């Protein structure tokens, strides 16, 4: 349970929907696909974080 501290986060990427940009927290990777979570702790799904070329916080997976 950490917000200021990428402990439970490690990677937090962004994405905009042509105008609205928000965060997506990312944990690990699987090939060219990454392993992300929604705006809560509920499951985990793969998403191309490679598309989140705005700014992300993943340093330990990099």
From Swiss-Prot:
GO biological process per UniProt: negative regulation of receptor-mediated virion attachment to host cell; superinfection exclusion
Intracellular or extracellular location(s): Host cell outer membrane
Cytoplasm as UniProt keyword: no
Induction summary: Expressed early during infection.
A GO cellular component annotation in the UniProt record: host cell plasma membrane
Annotated S-S bridges: none
Keywords: Early protein, Host cell outer membrane, Host membrane, Host-virus interaction, Lipoprotein, Membrane, Palmitate, Signal, Superinfection exclusion
Membrane topology: Lipid-anchor
Keyword ATP-binding in record: no
Chief site of localization: host cell
Task performed by this protein: Inhibits of the adsorption of T5 to its FhuA receptor. By this means, T5 within cells excludes superinfection by T5 and other phages using FhuA receptor as a ligand.
Designated name of the protein: Lytic conversion lipoprotein
Originating organism: Escherichia phage T5
Taxon lineage: Viruses, Duplodnaviria, Heunggongvirae, Uroviricota, Caudoviricetes
Gene this protein is translated from: llp
Residues of the full protein shown: 17 to 77 of 77
């Amino acid at each position: 349970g950490s917000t200021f501290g990428p402990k439970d986060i490690k990677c937090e990427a962004y994405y905009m929907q042509d105008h609205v940009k928000y965060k997506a927290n990312v944990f690990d990777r699987k090939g060219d696909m990454f392993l992300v979570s929604p705006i809560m702790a509920y499951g985990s799904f793969w998403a191309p974080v490679s598309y989140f070329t705005e700014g992300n916080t993943c340093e330990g997976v990099f």
